């Protein structure tokens, strides 16, 4: 199936998913000088106090921390968003080397990794019907740079040994995603897509300007995971990022002056 190698990576995905060459694909380069402050944006509200994590899973493309989204518990609202979006999962994209790994770039700068907190619009009832809508999803994207350890990441790093290969999962209750957020919620926003197949164009992206710092040791542990399943030849899970796609007829709006 699709992946990130020479033979099945991003430059191939359009064959099975022609929306790969669509009009509002993600990620994009954020040209900070061209992004315009939008005084029409309402304050962003990240409300993660009642978040209920359940499980961590290696899906062969990344690992996902999954949440109970059967009720309004961890939600995103405000900023560009109309109504309430429920957190369903987070995951990361990262590099084989510290100089690459993010999907969005900032004035062509690649960070070492990028976190995506995926939310769906509760007007649509569940995630599967939300991905049939042009405003079905909101993804909060957060850059990681290598520097000081992030203490609120270490519970994720420590469980990775238990989900090394594709299809492995573990319990992952009581994890507080507030520990992954930077101090500032200044952001850029634009309409885009899932960055993995099926590449659906449902996503309001909200990309925070402030990166979080993680340690070299933390990111090295991400790079020990495997794309393959248990008892298949080992292929390190690295460079699981899609490069920037054409901006087309879109404008990137800033939340800050
Ligand atoms: O459900 C989603 C998964 C990945 C994305 O990049 C966006 C939404
Ligand atoms: Zn992602």
DSSP notation for 12-61: GGGGT-GGGGSSS-S--EE-TTT-EE-TTPPPEEEE-TT--EEEEEE-SS
CATH number at residue 206: 3.10.200.10
Residues paired with 29 in a beta bridge: 105
- Binding-site residues for substrate: 195-196
Total tally of structural domains belonging to the chain? 1
Which residue range is the domain that position 49 belongs to? 1-257
Q: Which one of 137, 142, 245 would you pick to mutate in the ligand 1 pocket, going by the greatest count of ligand atoms within 8 A of its CB?
A: 137
Distance CA 111, CA 108 (A): 10
User: Of 31, 80, 34, 61, which is closest to residue 199 (Cα–Cα)?
Assistant: 61
User: Of 178, 140, 176, 156, which is closest to residue 52 (Cα–Cα)?
Assistant: 176
User: Of 113, 112, 90, 86, which is closest to residue 99 (Cα–Cα)?
Assistant: 112
Residue 150 beta carbon below 6 angstroms from any ligand 1 atom? no
Token duo for residue 216: 């070299």
- Binding-site residues for Zn(2+): 91, 93, 116
Distance CA 248, CA 216 (A): 36
Residue 137 beta carbon below 6 angstroms from any ligand 1 atom? yes
- In the block, which residue shows the tokens 């992952």? 172
Token duo for residue 244: 């920037």
DSSP string, 200-216: -S-EEEEEESSPEEE-H
State the method. Answer: X-ray
Residue 202 beta carbon below 6 angstroms from any ligand 1 atom? no
Say if residue 27 is preceded by a cis peptide, omega within 30 of 0: yes
Q: Is residue 220 within 8 Å of residue 5, measured between CB atoms?
A: no
Q: Which atom of ligand 1 is nearest to the CA of 131?
A: 1
Distance CA 104, CA 203 (A): 14
Torsion of CA 89, 85, 69, 222, to 10 degrees: 10
User: Of 152, 144, 170, 176, which is closest to residue 74 (Cα–Cα)?
Assistant: 176
Q: Is residue 250 within 8 Å of residue 28, measured between CB atoms?
A: yes
Q: Is 7 helix (H, G, I), strand (E, B) or coil?
A: coil
- Contacts for 254 with CB less than 8 Å, ≥ 6 apart: 35, 36, 37, 38, 186, 187, 188
Q: Which one of 116, 133, 199, 207 would you pick to mutate in the ligand 1 pocket, going by the greatest count of ligand atoms within 8 A of its CB?
A: 116
How far are the Cα atoms of 18, 28, 104, 181, 247 from residue 23, in angstroms, in the given order?
Answer: 11, 12, 17, 30, 8
Distance CA 38, CA 15 (A): 37
- In the block, which residue shows the tokens 């994207």? 141
**H helices present in 2-141, as ranges:** 127-130
User: Which value in Å is the resolution of this experimental model?
Assistant: 1.5
Residue 138 beta carbon below 6 angstroms from any ligand 1 atom? no
């Amino acid at each position: 199936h699709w992946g990130y190698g020479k033979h099945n990576g991003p430059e191939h995905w359009h064959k099975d998913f022609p929306i790969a060459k669509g009009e509002r694909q993600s990620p994009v380069d954020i040209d900070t000088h061209t992004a315009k402050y939008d005084p029409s944006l309402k304050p962003l509200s990240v409300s993660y106090d009642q978040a209920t994590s359940l499980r961590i899973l290696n899906n062969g493309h990344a690992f996902n921390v999954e949440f109970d989204d059967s009720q309004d518990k961890a939600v995103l609202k405000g900023g560009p968003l109309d109504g309430t979006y429920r957190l369903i999962q987070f995951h990361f994209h990262w590099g084989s080397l510290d100089g690459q790994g993010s999907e969005h770039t900032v004035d062509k700068k690649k960070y070492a990794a990028e976190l995506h907190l995926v939310h769906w619009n509760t007007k649509y009832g569940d995630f599967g019907k939300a991905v049939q809508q042009p405003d079905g999803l909101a993804v909060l994207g957060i850059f990681l740079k290598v520097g000081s350890a992030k203490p609120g990441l270490q519970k994720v790093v420590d469980v990775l040994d238990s989900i090394k290969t594709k299809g492995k999962s573990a319990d992952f209750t009581n994890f507080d995603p507030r520990g992954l957020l930077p101090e500032s919620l200044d952001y850029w926003t634009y309409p885009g897509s899932l960055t993995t197949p099926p590449l659906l164009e449902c996503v309001t992206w909200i990309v925070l300007k402030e990166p979080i710092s993680v340690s070299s040791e933390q990111v090295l542990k991400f790079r020990k995971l495997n794309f393959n399943g248990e008892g298949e030849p080992e292929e390190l899970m690295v460079d699981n990022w899609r490069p920037a796609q054409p901006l087309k007829n879109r404008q990137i709006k800033a939340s800050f002056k």
